[PDB]
Amino acid sequence: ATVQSPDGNIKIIISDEQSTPSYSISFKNKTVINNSALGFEFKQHAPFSNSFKITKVQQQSTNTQWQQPWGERQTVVDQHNEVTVTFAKPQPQGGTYSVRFKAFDSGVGFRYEVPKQAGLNNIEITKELTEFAVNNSHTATAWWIPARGWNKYEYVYNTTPLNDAALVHTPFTFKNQDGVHISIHEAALVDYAAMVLNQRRPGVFQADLTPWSSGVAVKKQGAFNTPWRTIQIGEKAVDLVNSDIILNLNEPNKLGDVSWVKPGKYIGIWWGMHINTHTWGSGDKHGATTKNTKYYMDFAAKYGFDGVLVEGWNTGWDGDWFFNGDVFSFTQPYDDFDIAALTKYSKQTGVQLIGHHETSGNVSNYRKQMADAFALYEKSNVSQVKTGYVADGGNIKRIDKNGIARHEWHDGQFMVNEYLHNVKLAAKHKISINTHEPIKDTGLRRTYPNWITREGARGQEFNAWGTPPNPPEHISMLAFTRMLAGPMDFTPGIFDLSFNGLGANTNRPQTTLAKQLALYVVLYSPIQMAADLPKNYLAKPDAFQFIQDVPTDWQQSIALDGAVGDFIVFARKERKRDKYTGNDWYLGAVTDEQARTIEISLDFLDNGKQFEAHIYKDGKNAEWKNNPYDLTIEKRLVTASDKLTLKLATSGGTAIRFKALL
Ligand SMILES: [Ca+2]
Ligand SMILES: [Cl-]
Ligand SMILES: [Mg+2]
């Protein structure tokens, strides 16, 4: 069976001539994915592997579009050809299943659909046989993080030959020697175990499902589907970025009117604890006090921020909070945090309190309090909550039905279901969720638009204490790996880079100041933190103006240029909403450890309109190690016929507001 992208450049051939059902993929008539197996093994049920033959194919197609409530673009185009391939094996130990393929111009998605059939009752998948067999893997280059490690998704990216990527998380991005970029991920991860990729014979990446502590991967009763497996394929690195395939493979919004989900910017009592000027627990330096929160709320109201995150407000942080998962209360504040007074003050100032639920990995202690916790927050006019699941890989703690503790992975079926329960329960209270230590993004924000962002990668916090901090190349890695999954709460915007001393050997953001500004356009998130202490913004009002101006919700987004681990340039047009007319464009660009010159056409600007570019760029002598603060701010009239030369310093950047005139 064969299905092709609408433009014909991606062609999938599905076969039954090999040991098992298999598929392969060509791009512009060159094989990029060789014969790759399909099927399942179960704990007790007979396997779905060899001797299945194709009995039927059903072709259809789609040419449609839909609108996001919020997002990196307002209108999403869905154009694909589709084939459903049915496989059957005669008895004994026979069966039937189908695989549905969708071929877009930017990539492929496929999933299994196992129908009701005799003998398929309570089953436990122990292995998914799905492969991604990369052609010419010996000359391919990959940029990846290891899977099943103690630090979960929070690793710096490795740059290696593809054959060296032994066991990796997705999105898993690489290029072949032709320059074709490919990224493997998944979409709509619901009631199933996350896929990790396990390189078997060279270049053959086999699905490796994250298991329960008991050892099985996925429990199902009767007929079941898998999540979509996705293979993005593009001629250029930015073709991976500009695809909507992940969103397009998710089910439409199930929450109805979600106008209560509000994109915006926030600050927080947060960074002070990470650089040790405050504590999460009680005492002389406690961050989360009534007085401190009112001070942050005053600052937010004056400078245009919608909410204040406060961590350490609830009892249980005293001592070593990493170990306190059993004792956190999610309803009882410390005596120096007056929720009633702050609820009053939030209404007075118009600044929201943003809630915080750290579990330190004990999801059962959280689950038993979760209804009371969201009831309190709903009663307190809290609309957004940051959650947290701090624990080593494989060390989620649950209490089972018999009162016995078990350890689970963050990305097994158990936790996949646990995260979605939290998001669905929050939605009943009109609360949106920002998940730290999450399951990776698989596009579910389409279906549940209150799941607004997540961490799931090394963000700014690792620049406070990472030892080492994030390297100069980190952003340019995230842009083509982690960010292909969806929005990230990176908490950009550190203005005081010197709290541990300058140079290359201290814990600090290893960037220039202008690069901190560029992050607001380079790294998409519907909520963006101004992460620094308020006094550090007051020291640099002119630079701070960019953070005050920049929106977080976009009518259109375009990655103009870039290369994985080297640089990226984004242009985005603001969405008309609240304060924003919808006429301004924004640009952000960052580089890695190298200073870089990038020529950019401004032909993304609206034709026939005049703009004033407000350019925030590295000063002439800027360099991140000992001169990160040199900064130039320039205003220049431009139109779509103009061009710009970006000059990025070492670990530098540029941020631009294109203000439409008239
Ligand atoms: Ca974290
Ligand atoms: Cl960074
Ligand atoms: Mg590089």
Side-chain angles (χ1 to χ4, degrees), residues 213-214 326 361-365 394-408 414:
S213 64
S214 77
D326 299 355
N362 184 330
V363 300
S364 298
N365 179 56
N395 278 260
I396 290 289
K397 176 184 180 169
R398 62 182 264 253
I399 307 297
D400 73 12
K401 67 173 109 67
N402 295 119
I404 297 165
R406 310 282 174 203
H407 280 135
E408 307 288 352
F414 167 78

Side-chain angles (χ1 to χ4, degrees), residues 255-263 383-384 423 426-433 449-451 577:
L255 297 183
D257 184 352
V258 290
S259 59
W260 48 271
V261 179
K262 310 287 193 184
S383 288
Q384 292 171 349
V423 168
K428 296 180 183 141
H429 299 81
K430 304 312 223 313
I431 290 171
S432 300
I433 295 296
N450 69 317
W451 205 350
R577 202 199 206 274

Side-chain angles (χ1 to χ4, degrees), residues 49 63 105 120 240 363-364 429 464 486 502 543 612-613 616 642 652 654:
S49 54
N63 178 19
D105 291 343
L120 184 81
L240 302 180
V363 300
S364 298
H429 299 81
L502 288 178
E612 178 181 71
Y616 301 74
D642 285 312
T654 288

Side-chain angles (χ1 to χ4, degrees), residues 473 476-477 563-567 592-594 596:
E473 69 180 6
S476 68
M477 289 293 183
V564 187
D566 290 347
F567 74 103
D592 57 3
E593 71 287 347
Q594 295 187 9
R596 276 182 206 279

Side-chain angles (χ1 to χ4, degrees), residues 460 463 470-471 474-475 490 511:
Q460 195 83 264
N463 292 333
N470 300 336
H474 188 54
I475 309 301
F490 183 91
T511 81

